[PDB]
Structures are given as structure tokens and as C-alpha cells.
């Protein structure tokens, strides 16, 4: 779930991904329409597919087990699906980390006039 996912980004990028990413590019927050505006975006985009493909469980509901040990985030659920929701969020918070510098404070709290375009398939 997001509770779990936010704490993961917020543990790779300072202490509150919830905001910058609550509505960024075209696929970061309350959106999901158009084409990725940049790193953070190709990420937020790639995240929801990753979520999408998990058909076995409910990515938005799944409560998985994880730990931030050594500066590395590890997943601890065996349930092959729960181990995925985590891997997706996990990678996601690494995606949002190594690209924090591409962040354009000019793309958050987005409209959709800038994304009314094609919601690229995945």
C-alpha cells in the first residue's frame, strides 16, 4: 500500500516524498494520462504498470514486509505476489532517489491540459 510505499521513497530521498510526488509530471500523483515528463516521471509511470501487472493480489491493498538495513531496502514476504508489490515500490523509491536532481519544481500539482495526450501503454 501507499502508506508502505511512501515510507520507502521517504527513506531514499530525505523525509517526505509525499508531496513532490503526490502530483508530479503526468504519472506521479493524481493523474496518469499522457507521456512521462522526465526521470521522476518515467518512474512514476513505470511504477503503475509494475503495479498493474500484479494480477494475483491487490498492489494498493497488499501489506508486505520490508526492512531498511545497511542503506539497502530488502523485501521479506515469501508470497510471490507480496514480494512483488514490494519490489515495485522498492525499485520505485530507488528510481525517485537517483533522479531527485532532475526534479522540476515546475511539474508538481499538474493539470492534465499538459497530459490530455496519450496515456502510453505499458
Amino acid at each position: 500500500n501507499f502508506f508502505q510505499f511512501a515510507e520507502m521513497i521517504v527513506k531514499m530521498t530525505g523525509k517526505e516524498a509525499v508531496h513532490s510526488y503526490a502530483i508530479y509530471g503526468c504519472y506521479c500523483g493524481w493523474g496518469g494520462q499522457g507521456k512521462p515528463q522526465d526521470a521522476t516521471d518515467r518512474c512514476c509511470f513505470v511504477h503503475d504498470c509494475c503495479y498493474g501487472t500484479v494480477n494475483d493480489c491487490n498492489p494498493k491493498m497488499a501489506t508486505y514486509s520490508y526492512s531498511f538495513e545497511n542503506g539497502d531496502i530488502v523485501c521479506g514476504d515469501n508470497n510471490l505476489c507480496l514480494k512483488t508489490v514490494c519490489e515495485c515500490d522498492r525499485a520505485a523509491a530507488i528510481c525517485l532517489g537517483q533522479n531527485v536532481n532532475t526534479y522540476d519544481k515546475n511539474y508538481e500539482n499538474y493539470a492534465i491540459s499538459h497530459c490530455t495526450e496519450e496515456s502510453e501503454q505499458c
Binding site: 501507499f2 493524481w30 496518469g32 494520462q33 496515456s119
Partner: protein, 122 residues
Amino acid sequence: NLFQFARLIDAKQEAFSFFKYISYGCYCGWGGQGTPKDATDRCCFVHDCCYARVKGCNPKLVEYSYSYRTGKIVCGGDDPCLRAVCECDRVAAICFRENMNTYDKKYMLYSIFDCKEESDQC
């Protein structure tokens, strides 16, 4: 997609009347656990638990066709998958309407000391 969800929510309520669900309670936006905190929250649950019924296509990246006529979100679309989604936004958007009075800011941006309950399943 959530762009449209921001849009449909506003129709009964006021424009931009959605920032208060970006993170509200246990389910509205970033969240997904510990059973609701009130009517509002549940709509955010029932809405979550709604996309999971979507057989086929994904709810967050799918743009549907819809029109707001004389105060009625009419989902006019010839694709059951897509139509469905719209209906998860119609029913919900109508839900939060009437439940904006049980509203309490003290259910905003929350964590795992309020939603650690026996996580109600869909």
C-alpha cells in the same frame, strides 16, 4: 485515471475539492489499512475495493469517456472495462459529497498508529 477522478469528485462538491483526499485517514490516497475512520474514508475503501473488480484493464492509466449533465455523471462509453472504472468514480464522487460534513482535518496525512488495526479485506 485519477485526473478524471479529481474531476468527477468536484462535480457535486467544489472545484479542487479533492486535495483533502490526497492523504486522508486510512484509505483516501496514500494509505490502505486499519479499517476506515468514517464514511468519507470508506468511500476511499469501497473505491479501492472497486478497481479490484475491474476484470481486464487497469484503472489508474485508463482514460474513459464521460459527461456531466445537469448534475449527473453519465458514463457514456461502449467498453465494460472502461465504463466500470468511471462508475467507481461516479459512485464515490457522490459518496464524499454527502459525507463532507462528517469531515475532520484530524484524519489528514496519517501513518501506522491509526491504521494498524485488523485490516478489513475487500
